[PDB]
Symmetry: D2
Subunit: 451 residues, 4 copies
Amino acid sequence: PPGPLPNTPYCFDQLRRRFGDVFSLQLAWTPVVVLNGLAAVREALVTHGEDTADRPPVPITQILGFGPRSQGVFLARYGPAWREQRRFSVSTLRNLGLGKKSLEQWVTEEAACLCAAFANHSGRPFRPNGLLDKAVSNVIASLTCGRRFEYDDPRFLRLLDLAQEGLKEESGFLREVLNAVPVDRHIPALAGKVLRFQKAFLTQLDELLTEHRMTWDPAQPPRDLTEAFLAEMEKAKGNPESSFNDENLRIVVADLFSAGMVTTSTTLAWGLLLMILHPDVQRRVQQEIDDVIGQVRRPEMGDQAHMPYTTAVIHEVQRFGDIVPLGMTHMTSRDIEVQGFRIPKGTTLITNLSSVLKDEAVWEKPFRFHPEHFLDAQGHFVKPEAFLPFSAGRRACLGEPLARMELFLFFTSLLQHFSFSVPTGQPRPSHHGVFAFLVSPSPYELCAVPR
Amino acid sequence: PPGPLPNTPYCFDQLRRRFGDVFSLQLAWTPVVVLNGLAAVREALVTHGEDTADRPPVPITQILGFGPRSQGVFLARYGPAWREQRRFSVSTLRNLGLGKKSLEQWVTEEAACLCAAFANHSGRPFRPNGLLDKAVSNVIASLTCGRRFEYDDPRFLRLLDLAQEGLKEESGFLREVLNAVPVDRHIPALAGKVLRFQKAFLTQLDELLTEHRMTWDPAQPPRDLTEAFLAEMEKAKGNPESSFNDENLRIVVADLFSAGMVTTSTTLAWGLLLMILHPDVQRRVQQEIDDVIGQVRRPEMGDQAHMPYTTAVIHEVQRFGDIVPLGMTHMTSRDIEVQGFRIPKGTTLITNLSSVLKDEAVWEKPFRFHPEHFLDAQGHFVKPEAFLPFSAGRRACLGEPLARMELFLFFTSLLQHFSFSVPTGQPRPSHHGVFAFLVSPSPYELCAVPR
Amino acid sequence: PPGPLPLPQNTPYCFDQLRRRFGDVFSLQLAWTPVVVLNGLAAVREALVTHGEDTADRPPVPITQILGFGPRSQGVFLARYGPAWREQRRFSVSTLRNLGLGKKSLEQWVTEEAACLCAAFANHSGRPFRPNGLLDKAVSNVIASLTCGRRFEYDDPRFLRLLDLAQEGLKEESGFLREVLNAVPVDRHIPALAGKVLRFQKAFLTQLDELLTEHRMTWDPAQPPRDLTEAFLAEMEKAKGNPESSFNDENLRIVVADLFSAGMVTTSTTLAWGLLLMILHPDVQRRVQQEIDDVIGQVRRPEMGDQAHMPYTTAVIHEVQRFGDIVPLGMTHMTSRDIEVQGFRIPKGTTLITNLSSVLKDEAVWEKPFRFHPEHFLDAQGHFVKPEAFLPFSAGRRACLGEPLARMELFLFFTSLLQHFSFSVPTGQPRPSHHGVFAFLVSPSPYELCAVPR
Amino acid sequence: PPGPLPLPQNTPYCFDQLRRRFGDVFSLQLAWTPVVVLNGLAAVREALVTHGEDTADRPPVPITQILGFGPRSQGVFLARYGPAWREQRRFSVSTLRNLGLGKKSLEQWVTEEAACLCAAFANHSGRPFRPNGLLDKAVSNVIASLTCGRRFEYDDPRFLRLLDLAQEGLKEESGFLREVLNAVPVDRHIPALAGKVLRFQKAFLTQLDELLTEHRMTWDPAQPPRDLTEAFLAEMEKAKGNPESSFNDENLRIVVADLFSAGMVTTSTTLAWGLLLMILHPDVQRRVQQEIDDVIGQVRRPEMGDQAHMPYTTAVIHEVQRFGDIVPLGMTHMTSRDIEVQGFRIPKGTTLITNLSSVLKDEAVWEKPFRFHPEHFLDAQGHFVKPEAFLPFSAGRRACLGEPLARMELFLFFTSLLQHFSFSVPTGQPRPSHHGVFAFLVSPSPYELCAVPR
Ligand code: HEM
Ligand code: HEM
Ligand code: HEM
Ligand code: HEM
């Protein structure tokens, strides 16, 4: 399983073009394998997806005192616990997604608030990041709290703080997880002070959902995800195992919040940046907006099908933005062939999602913002198989349906109500982004003016 | 002038204890000299202070289109321009300082707001950084705008943001200034897009002070620094030179804001952190507060002289906090002896202020929070010569008088009104800080409860 | 002149990215003083050939100053574009031509050195060894012939000290040389405590100084010069008026020093790549020997003339140089006045880095850039061809002085060795790496090989 | 067990900080798996002596797996605390003593090697050279004597191969050894393409394998063993019941391999420090020679017995060791069960780093820790004393096996040399560095010296 003997994506590109698509890091120690084709990624996550759906250990789990059946989804290990919970959330997001417009309602009204909040800046320039976080966040709060939050609500502002800083604390641990061993089984616990904010963030949910159980009517069909969880807690009251505890509830919600907010929010931030950066495209999206939705009604999901160019654009934002370059890290559950190579049980798989998204041999102009990628000769939307921002296989993103929804509803709502540009003095912002395990656009401010 | 042939502070300590106090970096290319004693620093900045008050070139000045007589103070080069302006600001801070309690007025009321703002969190935990930035910022706003700003004011929120990100943008250029050559005289100007936020920040001042210009009564004694500047402008209208332009006004204010806010704010953050970290000391400070000021009246500058322990404490916060470890970077105006060594005209001097503040041969417990450092056998305040957080000599900090004020007034006002602790679940924060050209405490939250 | 802007140890897999993000010409340190990296064959040709007269300057380095170079007492390698370097480039090309062809002088010296190298190999009796130290002695001796009159016994203590001195001195200068992709000249007057830094480079000059001092005593002033030193001494008389002119004692020893360092390690390392690849592709080795037996035979010594009739060996030798790719960034250049390349203005006094590797491994030029593939140099009929992308010695007014002598060394040593021996990996051993350790000079990772007669 | 917490090559001047911020015992990687750095003399003694039992384990390294170690076919150096290592520590200390002064065996072999070394030096005729290669040969030969019966001619191709193999092989292993301040064991089954990584270490085993195979032909099974291999072979006979027992052919060559690598480089590098400091402090050189002429004279060969009557030379040699400080971090240890040092709990299986440098250069112990200062070892009357802080060979159940033989080598080689020659810096040259290049082994930066008779 190749690789050499003795900042990271522009780096992996070299190793790829020296070693092929599948290659090994740390051959001599414990091998960590980097998957690079669309071909390589599909083979590992789809073809052998059941055996590569495990998560490599991280001290986060231990530090936060996870254990038995009290891990979330994100870092949960392949086993009953995770399967239980992947099951529950996909079930729950499909019932609420369609069902009685529940998820749609919550999003569309959140868009209306976001629009209000933008409008409140009176075309005086600002940076849309904080607002984009609140909006996206609220959608998850609806899903898991019953309520949405006032943008100025101190509780909400604390929650956001808690979820942001908790997430910078864990990415420390998460990037090192491209090498060293599990943890001495028993981390020092002085290790406590390291996830302060992550732990503080659990504590605040713990209570927000404690007061939600008080609201909840046990003798009626569940209204949101928490309620559907609590209900399921009843069925399983017997079972000494089963991952439906109070313990797990808050982690699950915590996961949804972190995994959910920042990814959707950051994308919309690339969206807006690219919109002011290619006003050509912006007009055309709005041209289509006025033709299909008009200026009176609220954009709804049904419009999506009739909106080739907007759809195309949204997808190109995702592919050019390329926000989670290495996705999240996997581990084998038993040995496995990929492209001929033996890959032993327990092995770190790094899934170079960026290499698929920016594949030179797939996309007409991989390093350019180019909505054509998604448009056929007639201007119908098409989506290449290389389109994998939410990854693929057993462990692909839980949120995909809700995110597809958020990106379409927020993005249109905004381009319907406003025209975005670069502030009239300013020298015009960068295409390139700052590269963590999550890539944001470098800070820009924009103007929003009505039409 | 010694040094070796072919992180940074724990690093220089080695080279010190291998090469002595004055040593050279880049001996073979262009030598950059690092000054290390209290002895070494005093000899360079005080003794030869007139020849070492120059600032090494940076692309910032060029990029922002500084030039003739249109640099501020901070990055201004040794010459008429900077002299003119150091002059003007020390004069102005001295008159406003005592004069008619102007600066004291502005500070004490700002402390009252800060206290209000804290009290608005109802003992539910928060991190004080944002509030500490607003308060300190307002003091500069008073100095330079006439009024203060509502904490929730969108213009103010934009201003702070602009001053923050613009300062992050410049510290990139500022830490590289421990090596490579000036700039090709004519930077690429595509280099524009690099200081977007610093430039955006100037533009917003430009208009905040433009509307002050109209408020201002030219036939009366100037009320604040801007006014005093404008007065001095009409005066020098003759002189084709003179640094009293519109051009320079905004850079000067910009300098005051950036140099002023973040330093004072960060210190107070270290203050509160150390307060909740050593409740022992907190009580004692409050013991004195109750004895000297009481529970009715607002702490005023006069009280300082009667408050040995609080003074001691505030100073130990500064010394342990050690926020600007390398100070700001200097350059020789002509050759110079220090500790025997020839130091050619045009030479980067790095002033290891941390090595002075944490001098092992000077302080009884350099790496510990220890207010005794400043208390004699009878518990009178004393200040060692090694106390140099504002540096020393020709180019020491302009703000020192206003900062001493800010620290005393804010810090006491707060410990008079509240008791600070670590949130009741939480594992208790770190002594150690994140090391840029400015060192902050790692993020902590605290509770503020009345007494 | 493009390149990335900030907010912010090995470098060629790195430049490949910046190339495919910024195009072929790009800038490092845009905001400070720009350093420009040339990437195409197109980009390189345009700077070093088209504007060659304005890009043939060398960027300052503390080496010159530390070694107390100055007026007309710099060598060729680090000499600054001016009368001095011009003077000396011309002398050495003149001198290498005359001796090259002339009376088989250079050929004679190389062939017999091959004969010793072969003897040295044969003395290991098929028991494995690494060929590096022998390859350094042989190559070195060719330069010793050029500049000292005689060759050296492989066990000679003076020789062994010389090689030691030239190796470590070269190790001391590469420190300075890699940093020369950024900071300013030197305070005009380096600290001189800076002495202790080139100890071995200085020691190496002192020993030459003395080997050539005793050559001067041998030299017959009233007869045609027999080697490069002699032709230098003659030219020194000629100029004994001129207060300027770079023909001093001062400059002699630097010039030789340059020839020794530039010359030995480069040729030597290539031959090391040659043998490694030979044992690594025994397929090719047989074919080269097939040809050898056809053209030269088993009795006479390979000579330069055979080269023309040996397509496949030529091909191979060239593919060794291209895959080996030993001096990836070449040596560093500087503009003498502004210049445009690919549309871009490039100001007087500017560090040019010439990415030779990017030309040699050009994806858009070579069928299989990352593979050992002699076909690169063979047409459909199996005649030797050389693409324009073949630039291991670089190009333009400052391209390698040594090219004719090195073409000669590679051909003669490499054939001589494949004529007499068969090389292979020692019988237990796991088989060595294609990849090499990346200094400003890239070697093969250490391997040992067996040399058995045929 | 203290140490810093996060959010985020040249490591000893680094540890000094953490020491003076966290105390003597502190933790690396608290949040992952803790690695503990011992700093006092106090901290080191407590761990290695007091709990020496339970800290005598070696942390896993891919080296063992890669070299196909396994059951009880590990050497001593990397061997894991167990029957295997106990067996073999015991065999080597037993054997080194019997040979130490039983019948002057070890002494005879060292003293004659000194006499060759002296000849080899003398053969450079006062013309300058660097003593490193010769220092490696001599030290190496002592080990050859112990393990091959033979010594080797300094020009012997086999010997030259062997040294080459033992150097590069040791280069290759220090890659692995310095990462062993963090990441996990190895996937139990390393990729084996991992083969190509220790080529030279494996090549080195193979050559011993067959130097010692021809030793067994020589060896007379019905007589008292005359060196370490022979003693091993006899012990192998007796254990040819026991299915376990570490006395195999398998283990023999690793044991020798260990003795060669551990042994040669350390002793050789010290002597290199010794000579460098001698030319660097000619003041001290004369005084050592003054003592030499007083005690040994100019006729007879220095012998071990002279050591007792030679306070100043002893002092000096010890100061060379302390100042030189060649293995700064020693070798890395691991706990066999939990353990409480300076109050702190240290869990079963934990990487202990023993900062030997911090003990040798302890500021609170040595009058002038950063200066070459033989007084450290001389009392008020000029009797030799040795502080407890003198720990170059470390301490405890896993302290250096070679100490007696090393003490011997240092005295005999060092005196022999200073008796016959006077060492100085070459007459042109600017005079070398006190400071050294910092691997897991610290050498003096390359210097050359002159040896002239007296
Ligand atoms: C454009 C917005 C989003 C993007 C680009 C995105 C992308 C991803 C990616 C790449 C993964 C890694 C899957 C793997 O390990 O192969 C992931 C996992 C995950 N995501 Fe998303 N996501 C987005 C929105 C959301 C939101 C809205 C939610 C919840 C509301 C969510 C919840 C999750 C969860 C729970 C996982 C862990 C999956 C598991 O461990 O079973 N994501 N996401
Ligand atoms: C505890 C709060 C503060 C600290 C620790 C501090 C520290 C420093 C330091 C170390 C320098 C570098 C001087 C040198 O180059 O050697 C400096 C310069 C400067 N500071 Fe402060 N400062 C503080 C507050 C302030 C405030 C409140 C102001 C204005 C309101 C201010 C304005 C300036 C200016 C304009 C300079 C540039 C001096 C010149 O270039 O002439 N500082 N300060
Ligand atoms: C395969 C063996 C060799 C290779 C690959 C090689 C390559 C090079 C390269 C890349 C340069 C840099 C030119 C530039 O600045 O663009 C150079 C320069 C030079 N080479 Fe070589 N060379 C080899 C053998 C030799 C030998 C045998 C000699 C002399 C015996 C020699 C003498 C020189 C000299 C004196 C320069 C400096 C040119 C100047 O500044 O005018 N080279 N060589
Ligand atoms: C000045 C010469 C030498 C020095 C400074 C030296 C130093 C050391 C040190 C620091 C250790 C590490 C012990 C530990 O783990 O704490 C060690 C171990 C060892 N040394 Fe030496 N050594 C020297 C000479 C020798 C020689 C001459 C031999 C054999 C001829 C030798 C054989 C060994 C062996 C086999 C070990 C491993 C001990 C074990 O794992 O049980 N050393 N040495």
